[PDB]
Design a protein around this ligand. Sequence first.
Ligand SMILES: Nc1ncnc2c1ncn2[C@@H]1O[C@H](COP(=O)(O)OP(=O)(O)OP(=O)(O)O)[C@@H](O)[C@H]1O
Ligand SMILES: Nc1ncnc2c1ncn2[C@@H]1O[C@H](COP(=O)(O)OP(=O)(O)OP(=O)(O)O)[C@@H](O)[C@H]1O
Ligand SMILES: Nc1ncnc2c1ncn2[C@@H]1O[C@H](COP(=O)(O)OP(=O)(O)OP(=O)(O)O)[C@@H](O)[C@H]1O
Ligand SMILES: Nc1ncnc2c1ncn2[C@@H]1O[C@H](COP(=O)(O)OP(=O)(O)OP(=O)(O)O)[C@@H](O)[C@H]1O
Ligand SMILES: Nc1ncnc2c1ncn2[C@@H]1O[C@H](COP(=O)(O)OP(=O)(O)OP(=O)(O)O)[C@@H](O)[C@H]1O
Ligand SMILES: Nc1ncnc2c1ncn2[C@@H]1O[C@H](COP(=O)(O)OP(=O)(O)OP(=O)(O)O)[C@@H](O)[C@H]1O
Ligand SMILES: Nc1ncnc2c1ncn2[C@@H]1O[C@H](COP(=O)(O)OP(=O)(O)OP(=O)(O)O)[C@@H](O)[C@H]1O
Ligand SMILES: Nc1ncnc2c1ncn2[C@@H]1O[C@H](COP(=O)(O)OP(=O)(O)OP(=O)(O)O)[C@@H](O)[C@H]1O
Ligand SMILES: [Mg+2]
Ligand SMILES: [Mg+2]
Ligand SMILES: [Mg+2]
Ligand SMILES: [Mg+2]
Ligand SMILES: [Mg+2]
Ligand SMILES: [Mg+2]
Ligand SMILES: [Mg+2]
Lengths: 261, 260, 257, 261
Amino acid sequence: MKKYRVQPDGRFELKRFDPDDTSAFEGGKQAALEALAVLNRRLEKLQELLYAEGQHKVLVVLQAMDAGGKDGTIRVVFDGVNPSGVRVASFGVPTEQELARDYLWRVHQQVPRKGELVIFNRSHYEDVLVVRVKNLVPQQVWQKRYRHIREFERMLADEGTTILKFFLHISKDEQRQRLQERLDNPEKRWKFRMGDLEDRRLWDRYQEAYEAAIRETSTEYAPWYVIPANKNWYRNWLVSHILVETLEGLAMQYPQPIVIE
Amino acid sequence: MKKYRVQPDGRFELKRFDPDDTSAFEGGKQAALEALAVLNRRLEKLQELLYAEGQHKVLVVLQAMDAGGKDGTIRVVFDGVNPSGVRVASFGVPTEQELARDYLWRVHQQVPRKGELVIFNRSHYEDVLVVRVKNLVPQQVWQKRYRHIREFERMLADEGTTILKFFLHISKDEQRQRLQERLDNPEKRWKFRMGDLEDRRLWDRYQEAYEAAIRETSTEYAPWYVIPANKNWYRNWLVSHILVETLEGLAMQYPQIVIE
Amino acid sequence: MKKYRVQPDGRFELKRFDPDDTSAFEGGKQAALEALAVLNRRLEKLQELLYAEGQHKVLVVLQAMDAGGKDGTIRVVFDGVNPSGVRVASFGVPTEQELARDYLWRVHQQVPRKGELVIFNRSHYEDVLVVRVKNLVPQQVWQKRYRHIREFERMLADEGTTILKFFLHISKDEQRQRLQERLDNPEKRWKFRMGDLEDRRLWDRYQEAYEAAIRETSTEYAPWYVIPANKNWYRNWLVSHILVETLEGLAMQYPQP
Amino acid sequence: MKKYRVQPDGRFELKRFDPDDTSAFEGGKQAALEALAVLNRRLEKLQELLYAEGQHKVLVVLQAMDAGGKDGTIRVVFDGVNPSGVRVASFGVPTEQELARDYLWRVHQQVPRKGELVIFNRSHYEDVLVVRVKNLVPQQVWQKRYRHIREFERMLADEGTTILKFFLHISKDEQRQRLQERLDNPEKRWKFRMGDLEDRRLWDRYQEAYEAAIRETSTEYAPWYVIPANKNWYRNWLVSHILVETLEGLAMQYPQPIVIE
Ligand SMILES: Nc1ncnc2c1ncn2[C@@H]1O[C@H](COP(=O)(O)OP(=O)(O)OP(=O)(O)O)[C@@H](O)[C@H]1O
Ligand SMILES: Nc1ncnc2c1ncn2[C@@H]1O[C@H](COP(=O)(O)OP(=O)(O)OP(=O)(O)O)[C@@H](O)[C@H]1O
Ligand SMILES: Nc1ncnc2c1ncn2[C@@H]1O[C@H](COP(=O)(O)OP(=O)(O)OP(=O)(O)O)[C@@H](O)[C@H]1O
Ligand SMILES: Nc1ncnc2c1ncn2[C@@H]1O[C@H](COP(=O)(O)OP(=O)(O)OP(=O)(O)O)[C@@H](O)[C@H]1O
Ligand SMILES: Nc1ncnc2c1ncn2[C@@H]1O[C@H](COP(=O)(O)OP(=O)(O)OP(=O)(O)O)[C@@H](O)[C@H]1O
Ligand SMILES: Nc1ncnc2c1ncn2[C@@H]1O[C@H](COP(=O)(O)OP(=O)(O)OP(=O)(O)O)[C@@H](O)[C@H]1O
Ligand SMILES: Nc1ncnc2c1ncn2[C@@H]1O[C@H](COP(=O)(O)OP(=O)(O)OP(=O)(O)O)[C@@H](O)[C@H]1O
Ligand SMILES: Nc1ncnc2c1ncn2[C@@H]1O[C@H](COP(=O)(O)OP(=O)(O)OP(=O)(O)O)[C@@H](O)[C@H]1O
Ligand SMILES: [Mg+2]
Ligand SMILES: [Mg+2]
Ligand SMILES: [Mg+2]
Ligand SMILES: [Mg+2]
Ligand SMILES: [Mg+2]
Ligand SMILES: [Mg+2]
Ligand SMILES: [Mg+2]
């Protein structure tokens, strides 16, 4: 798509994106599930081509507020790939060894190699999101990181990495409903922690942090896509569509090449 | 389904397992696909429990002759899991850095952590398989590795790893048909390399190497399962059944407010 | 000099080794410093041969009670090597990621490669030492680890690693004097941690843990050497002599041009 | 200390540095060996402070033509440190796995952590040196790497790394004598490769590549120091002096906190 791609003009406004927007797809849930199965079959062939050709490196970054759909998006990408060529690198609370080096160290370690597709569940962007919102480093420090990120991603892209960054955009009320469903389910309540409730108060600070991160780092070589994600079906379809179209654009070729006894 | 577990008596004979055997399933392909969907739903809940509890470490080892089903088995495992808690560690031709350390170094690095399920696509067993068949090290060296492997796996099991080793067993003629299909498909012919044709001449040497590896290392703490795998549907169902039953046996427990 | 190698008979008694023993050296500190300088020049040639030949893997394990000499021994090895071919892998308090895998995982990661000498400052032995003494896992668990260690080390040795394990043996009163010296030095008191005082009470439990570990794991392919270490000069000389003699035994040669 | 620091004005000229220059030291070899022992004793205390304080990260980069002194410089640094807090990360011919990721991947992996001093024996600079000289990638690719390097180093410095880059400067005739000495010594002959002979014909191309890299990447946060290195004694003294003075400038403090029974 083009309406969801954030232009590299530094004029991005998050208020312009409605989490309930479903306008790029004509039809609803059922037609989208059918379109998604078609995309999965296309993705299987494209991922196998990615691997067999062994030249491109594909990085998919997923960022979202908790219950925003990162987990669900990973599952629908995996529905259309060979797990031997695709992996998830997730980024959680940094360890002492990770904090003992620059914040990009643990992230750079996990970049896709040639013929590989890697999904970052959270990423280096957390170092300008939770780090900024919770003041884990002073502003003097984290404000410099927007340039570090643009330049790290420029180097990655110049050296052969195709970068797709998706912000799965849900509303506060949608998050409320999804978090209540987790609490009410005995098989999901383990996902609740001490402080999750008081973190909801920081909703607006996170939205500002996301808007600043996206505006600062959406570039030609590393675009951000804002995905209206209140509807799981639309989020899954749209992310799959963008990923498949991006892979098609690489114009990948099988390597150039008998009766077995 | 216990007929496929190799007893730790060192009396295993590969000739006793028919790759065409489908006797553990009282039906065919259609009924097995339905049973497999049920196993996939059970596996999703079990894997999430594995992660949420965060105590067990699960290692699934896949070994098979080329076209034997490792790739297809990985896909049916992933059909029943969350990719955030399961990963594939594949073992290919060792690099100079890997050969500069003991053969278990590159393998030990990839073991599952607590709350994780790892699939080894090939494994430390290649160090008594291709290494043995192609004489990549003298026999004096690779013969000692059966004990190294039993002891490495004993340490893993003692320290909390549940180990499942599957030998996906196909016939020489089944491999021939499957390799011919790869060659004839323009989207799969990239898999073929000249040298595969010479590798076919070594079929019997590999069967002997597999029999000796299985006989030497199938233990109570790290059993081998011989999977008749000429039928993709049977291999998928049986591996999924064993994995789900193993995870059920762990009796995992979930760890021990109105939002405005 | 072979009186310090613990025979693989499972009959080792730590009481038979006196931390004040200097009997293998017929002289004192000054003559030993000169002998150590000769061993240092020998080690430089042997380490370069190790690297150039690029076939052997050398693992040196250091274990000692705090202030026992691991740090001083590392310096004395480094005085006779090219730092480009020798490295220190130190083992501290396990992290969550390290504890999430078997205790050998973090250790196996660090093994020397061909043409390399690695010094383990502490090692997998801590998993039968501080783990046993502080009951970090039940005895049913840590008792099984003696066999794991023998078998891990057998595999390493079979696959080409020369293993040397040194237990730098100091007395309780020597440790007390050395720890008091750290506290009294403004440039060293940063080493003192809260809990080091209460850990002094566990001295005898550590001595028992060391004896049991050494008795269980000193083998023909992976010997333990008990180093009387109350005298820094004697510990440095003896470790250096054993290391140099071990490397000489490998009969290494420069690759042919 | 100032005459050897390459100013970040992009006007660097390698012809202005004489490999035989010993002007920063009054006296010769013997007085310098004594001054070096004094610097080693100072370095031991400073490195221990670096470790005990556990806050700064120190990166020393060594680049030189073969026989230029990287090996000798490493030994002289190690003469004044505790090996438990200092390590050498050397960069050789990239492996298939290293080439399957961006050239900075293998380098970033090895950066010093808090309280650590790391010496890079060769570095990311090889990706604009041999890579450029032997045309291992097209110019369109390697020309973009000067910016990647400035920006990677900016990020490292902003996030707490003190960076020292030393170009150990030897003349063509000095290299010739040193390489001849290796061939003539039975204990050093093993270092000789046959491609080494034909690599001598590329001397001028390497000098141009070094001048371009120094000019492009000597910045305020990551300076290059050109070390006249025809005299081993002067190279050892000068590198040790710069390192010690840099560590002194960090104003490191021991962490602030009894009769043992
Ligand atoms: N750079 C970072 N600094 C601090 N915390 C971080 C950083 N990167 C990730 N985290 C945090 O790690 C945690 C991971 O927690 P967990 O695995 O339970 O997922 P989660 O709570 O569902 O995350 P999310 O809110 O993104 O959905 C998140 O709370 C995230 O904010
Ligand atoms: N079955 C599972 N296996 C492995 N990791 C899991 C599993 N279920 C959840 N997780 C992890 O637990 C944490 C909390 O779960 P959560 O559903 O919030 O996922 P998520 O990736 O953060 O997605 P979302 O954006 O919807 O919050 C995340 O770190 C997630 O990756
Ligand atoms: N320890 C080892 N020593 C030597 N070769 C090894 C070792 N481990 C794996 N290999 C080889 O690495 C190769 C991996 O090749 P590839 O990824 O193309 O898969 P493959 O040919 O389909 O393997 P397989 O025959 O198991 O299906 C195999 O030929 C395997 O024998
Ligand atoms: N789409 C893919 N993405 C990543 N790796 C792939 C993909 N398809 C195949 N491979 C890898 O290519 C190699 C050859 O493929 P192959 O079909 O033989 O798989 P396999 O795992 O060896 O299974 P089998 O036991 O059937 O031979 C293997 O290393 C496999 O993992
Ligand atoms: N397997 C392990 N389990 C628990 N603690 C461990 C383990 N391995 C090492 N440690 C501990 O890590 C710590 C390292 O601490 P530190 O770097 O300050 O050195 P130290 O106190 O001087 O150690 P030592 O007493 O051996 O001289 C020691 O207290 C040691 O007991
Ligand atoms: N200058 C230094 N650089 C790096 N690490 C250091 C330095 N000095 C001490 N250490 C580390 O600090 C810790 C405490 O120091 P310590 O003197 O006890 O060393 P050690 O290796 O445990 O030797 P010993 O057996 O004498 O206790 C150890 O982990 C040691 O490696
Ligand atoms: N990025 C890179 N691309 C290609 N070759 C590289 C790269 N980095 C390092 N190398 C090469 O790796 C080799 C390392 O070889 P070796 O260990 O024998 O040291 P050397 O020949 O003495 O190096 P130098 O010439 O720097 O003194 C050098 O020839 C160096 O040019
Ligand atoms: N004793 C040794 N142990 C380990 N590595 C060594 C040893 N001697 C030399 N090397 C390595 O062998 C290679 C060739 O040696 P060389 O003398 O050229 O070193 P160097 O670091 O490249 O220094 P210089 O700048 O003088 O060329 C380098 O990679 C060097 O690090
Ligand atoms: Mg979440
Ligand atoms: Mg990577
Ligand atoms: Mg195969
Ligand atoms: Mg490699
Ligand atoms: Mg091998
Ligand atoms: Mg200590
Ligand atoms: Mg050199």
